[PDB]
Amino acid sequence: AWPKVQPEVNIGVVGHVDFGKTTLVQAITGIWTSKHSEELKRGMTIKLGYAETNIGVCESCKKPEAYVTEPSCKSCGSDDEPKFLRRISFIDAPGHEVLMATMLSGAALMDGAILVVAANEPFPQPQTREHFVALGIIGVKNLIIVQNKVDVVSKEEALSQYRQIKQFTKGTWAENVPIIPVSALHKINIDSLIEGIEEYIKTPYRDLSQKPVMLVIRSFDVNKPGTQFNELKGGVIGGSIIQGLFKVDQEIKVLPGLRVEKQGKVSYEPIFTKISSIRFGDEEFKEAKPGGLVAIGTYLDPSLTKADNLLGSIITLADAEVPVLWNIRIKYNLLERVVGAKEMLKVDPIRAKETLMLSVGSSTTLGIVTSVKKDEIEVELRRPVAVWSNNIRTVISRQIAGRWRMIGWGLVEI
Template identity: 55%
Template sequence: MPKKPKEPKQETHKAVKPDAEEKAEKPKKAKAAEKIGIEKAEKTEKKPSKSSKGSVQPEVNIGLVGHVDHGKTTLTERLSGKWTDTHSEELKRGITIRLGYADAVFRKCTKCKGTDAYTTKEKCPKCGSQAEFVRKVSFVDAPGHESLMATMLSGAMIMDGALLLVAANESCPQPQTREHLMALDIVGVKKVIVVQNKIDLVGKEQALKNYNEIKKFLSETPYKDAPIIPISAQHSINIDLLIETIEEYIPTPKRDETKKAMMLIARSFDINKPGSDPTKMVGGVLGGAIIQGKLSVGEEIELRPGRKIEKENKMFYEPVFTKITGIKTGGEDVNEAKPGGSIGVLTRLDPSIVKSDTLVGNVVGHKGNLPMIWDKLTLETHLLKRVVGAKRDLDVDPIKVGEILMLNVNSAATVGVVSALAKDSFKCNLKLAVCADAGAKVAISRRVANRFRLIGYGTIKA
């Protein structure tokens, strides 16, 4: 059931002392870390790019998904120039653990023809001519490891299209190839391009065999007509063809800026260095994407469900209120952000409550204009016939009372304990509350062989 949140009498969790608030809003204090496309700010105020340089904010979010070690992060680097595995554990293990973000500018040479004209360079690498701006995009690099499916699903909620990477030197489909494609279908991502990577590691015969495996796999899914582009991310082979295909197949969606603002938080972090002078610290940063409406610097905002509070031995959620002190997108400061690519919102929030993705799953909007907070859900269910992503072919058994399920709602991942069953629906109590509209789609996973596996989806009933 939806819970009416309590509203604090004044702004909560300010990041700085009153005498330092003026300083915190200056651009020279907005030293955003190189996460979700936020580059370090200059000490002098930046002005948005001129129209000749193209749009400052990326127009579209494109996910990179697929089985572990199939080249998602390498391809992201080839397209954007940024290596998204920067977390210490990611560097040590060589796999993506958190969502990675990077922006890229697609350009087109005015002299070269066809595929050869597409590049991410300001000057055409083939003829040296100046390349014209086409579009700026954000890439969301999702983890491919089976234990990180909740993170992948959270990222999928903000994707407008996706690149499904398939390694040519392995059989297709691998478990998470199948699971990720099903996840894209469940959350409503319609535009998918299959990228047959690592063609440099196989001969022509193996490449064709793998291509036919991909075609057969896709024929059993809603993506049977998806383009298949052979590349080598490692050697930058066919990157121009991939850019051309993205431009033709994944258009910028129509956005509604007149609706009430709603931003999904996919990352949150503290950008202050250890040992910083408390009077010079800046507030926490919220990273994610606006799905409707728009947000501006100086506006008061609300985060729901907010923070879990305990009073008189009772637990409840209290929305968090703060002010936007800066917005960064495409590596630049802007006064306003609209639906489209990833952005970073600088706030007055205490850095300690946003660090290490603590606020991931929250929804941001203007005060009093966000959906309800739910700590219990009734879901109308649509279960799959087979468990997706498991190494063995398993049927999906009916949901049982007392069963623990993983639920992905917007960018939030929570656990629900089933409390009651009905025909094609069930009720559950949530471990972590969520903010969502009635009718919102929820991905449902159950524990199979010590891993949560996708078994279907539900819609929230009021």
Template identity: 55%
Template structure:
């Protein structure tokens, strides 16, 4: 039986810059996901942010009022029972960081499309992020109409109609639209109820070969640390299948890039798992669903500054072979991403650089 305190689903937050995604995650989890110094300085998300939240439900209060992020019922004050823990992936909304958002979409089982009520809909990255969700096939979507506390009821209704017109004919046409104020935590119960209804945990196969998608990698040692206290590198991400236990030997592919006889080759990395964390909780085994951090015996120089992002971890000898030639079908987006203006897609040109989301 699944432990409700361990996350089993990854929910992405996507949408235009400054529409309140990080504030919403903070309101749901108590964690401010912009931890990087440049993010603090500029006031925007640059890297993928992560946080877990446990949701509670009161048996006495039916409907949205009974859902809460607190073990104490906001209506009757009685103790609530935890029923679900989820991991949130906070994707950047700035147009120059679209690649980061696309890489994060590989981890998402569902998504919240956050749209601020105090700006006309759609904004450029609102359109781009919805296109991205369609491209990668994320169908479980909840639309969050944020910042309803700074507009009048009439303007909120007008904005709601703009959202309905925008999503008509898209993958999010039938998605619920939940009005909230992330800043003042208004209507959070209704949002939790919608997430429970519309973004269920997908079926996983814990008995399959382990495959972990790496979305972050870190050096957790502070400058000036004593060499005796140094910790190995940390990888963060999500298991799509299988399980990894504390003490397991794991392999990371494709690994380290090397030059051999004027050719670029990749050498897989082998290391040992020394710790596994989900949120603030240390666990003995990582299972599919939810986000986790795995401590290893790797040299931190290999994992620092997200150097292993996009790689795959699993048990030694059980990962797919490394390929240097691929044949695939390309589906281009409807407009140029990462641009503040509307630019049409033109036919591909020889030697033109492309950003691929596979």
């Protein structure tokens, strides 16, 4: 039989709106990531979606057909059980420009990524570029480019686009990134994509000597309505472990924590709690490691976790020393152009007193520029940000024409 383990690697699925990301994830895993009513109604990804699958290989069969997502080699004639390779999971990003920030949060959780371009659309589009550049900046460079919807066009049209993609990636970090043509909707050439995932998105080395840190993107509760108000199950916090590992019954804290109001005034206090359960999808475990999206059950009052209240938080061991900053210094670099914009546009230099948006881990925060130099800015934050390490990248956005657009990036200096 195949073992029941947690996913050991996270793969982002990103790209311009409507190019078929969620359908691609479904073609691979059998799962439709959209769980919210607004998503189903509007036919769009809004919150980060998630899906897992085992990956295995039929050792006596021919590739790529030998790659399977279930323990059966029948499809290639063998009666032998396929060799289990690993369990993987997908972080399904929204393509809509207005949801760029969400993509950025998701990118903090990715070990690698798939960029979806549509074969029946002109390359390249605004969020094709924006997501590409974001991936580069954040360091998600184990990339596969998927040419989706090939069922819609002839082979020569798809090839013409392929040439365009090669031209675009040339002279960049992605020059040798593979391009794999599929039909997500009708499930064509999906096995070449599995093969490509095994070849180009290896499970990263996980440094065990690192303190446990989890980035939070979800929070909620498994409390069915009508449940007795003093028999309620504790709050659940969802996210991804980016370093170290967590274990059931560990004492943890949520940083910055909860918003405290004294009269008018607003401060933040760390939320201390204990891990009551660890869950990956539908399976329970005794420990949680990087790779996958984990649901950490706690003893917290459900009202503290309801409706993704803790999005952007981090979780650490109770006694970890973690700076929670209302002011930050960033060693920065601006893009030449606002890549996410429909019309070509130059990036204006940072100006004192202007409001910027900062993506740090899974958090998104507005701040006012208090100092500008050539290589560094200092920012006064509207809400504090937990900074768990010395080498954390931030992505910098500016509001242009009422739209938050990525304009640069930097290192948060402590």
